[PDB]
C-alpha cells in the first residue's frame, strides 16, 4: 500500500511491488519455501566465506605487497594491499567474482621470490573457496528440493495406509473387498466429525441425547476419549457378526 502511495511522487517505486507479489502464485511460492527452508545455513556458510577471505587477505598484506597493482605505466597510485580494508574489499569484490581465482588480477608471479609460495596460495584459495563453497550452496538447495519432496511422499504414504484415527493400516480393511475406502469414507472419515461438531454447537443443551450430552461434557472437559484410537466397530464385531 505505502509503496503504491509513495509511487505518486512521479517515480519508479511501483516497480519494486511485483517481486514478492509473485508469492501469491502457488508454485513459485513452493520453490521459495524450499530455498527458505535452509537459508540460515546458507548465511553461516557466507560467514565462513567472510572469515576465510579475511584470513587470506593478511597473507598478501604482509608478504605479497609488490603485486596487487594495476600496472599503469610509470606509476602506481593504485595498490589494493596497503590499506587492509581495501584489500579485503579487493578480494571479496574481485577474487570471488573472477571465476578462476585471483590469477587474472595480479602481477605475474614468475619472478623468483616466493613464486611457489604465491602459487600454492592462489590454487588453495581457488579450490577451497570457489568450488567447495559454491558447491555447498548448490547442494543445500538441492537437498531442499529433495527434502520437501520426501515430505510429500511421506505424508501421502502415511495417509494412504491408515485411517488417521485408529493406527490401523489398510491390511485389515482389505480382508473384505474394497474395505479401506469404505472405512475412510463411510466409516470415520474426518469430515463427518466436523459436521457433528457444528451440529452439536448449533443445537441447544436441553435436547441432546445421552450420547450428545456426554460428548458435549467431554468436549468442554477437553478430553478426547470419544475417538477410538485403535478399535473401529469391526474388531469389536469380528467374531460375532462380521
Amino acid at each position: 500500500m505505502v509503496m503504491s502511495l509513495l509511487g505518486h511522487y512521479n517515480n519508479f517505486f511501483f516497480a519494486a511491488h511485483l517481486l514478492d507479489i509473485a508469492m501469491g502464485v502457488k508454485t513459485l511460492r513452493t520453490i521459495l519455501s524450499s530455498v527458505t527452508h535452509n537459508g540460515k545455513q546458507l548465511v553461516m556458510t557466507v560467514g565462513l566465506l567472510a572469515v576465510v577471505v579475511y584470513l587470506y587477505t593478511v597473507v598478501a598484506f604482509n608478504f605479497f605487497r609488490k603485486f596487487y597493482n594495476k600496472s599503469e605505466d610509470e606509476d602506481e597510485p593504485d595498490m589494493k594491499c596497503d590499506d587492509m580494508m581495501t584489500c579485503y574489499l579487493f578480494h571479496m569484490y574481485v577474487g570471488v567474482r573472477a571465476g578462476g581465482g585471483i590469477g587474472d588480477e595480479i602481477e605475474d608471479p614468475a619472478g623468483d621470490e616466493y613464486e611457489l609460495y604465491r602459487v600454492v596460495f592462489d590454487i588453495t584459495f581457488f579450490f577451497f573457496v570457489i568450488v567447495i563453497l559454491l558447491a555447498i550452496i548448490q547442494g543445500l538447495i538441492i537437498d531442499a528440493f529433495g527434502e520437501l519432496r520426501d515430505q510429500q511422499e511421506q505424508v501421502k504414504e502415511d495417509m494412504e495406509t491408515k485411517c488417521f484415527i485408529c493406527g490401523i493400516g489398510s491390511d485389515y480393511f482389505d480382508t473384505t473387498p474394497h474395505g479401506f475406502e469404505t472405512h475412510t469414507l463411510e466409516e470415520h472419515n474426518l469430515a463427518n466429525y466436523m459436521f457433528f461438531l457444528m451440529y452439536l454447537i448449533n443445537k441447544d443443551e436441553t435436547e441432546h441425547t445421552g450420547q450428545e450430552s456426554y460428548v458435549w461434557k467431554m468436549y468442554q472437559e477437553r478430553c478426547w476419549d470419544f475417538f477410538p484410537a485403535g478399535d473401529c466397530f469391526r474388531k469389536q464385531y469380528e467374531d460375532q457378526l462380521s
Partner: peptide, 23 residues
C-alpha cells in the same frame, strides 16, 4: 621449505603426511 628441494629434502614429514609440492 627450500625452493628447489622444498617438497623433498626440506620437509619430508609433511610431504609424507600429505603429498604437496608447493609449501
Amino acid at each position: 621449505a627450500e625452493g628447489a628441494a622444498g617438497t623433498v629434502a626440506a620437509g619430508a614429514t609433511a610431504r609424507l603426511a600429505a603429498a604437496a609440492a608447493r609449501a
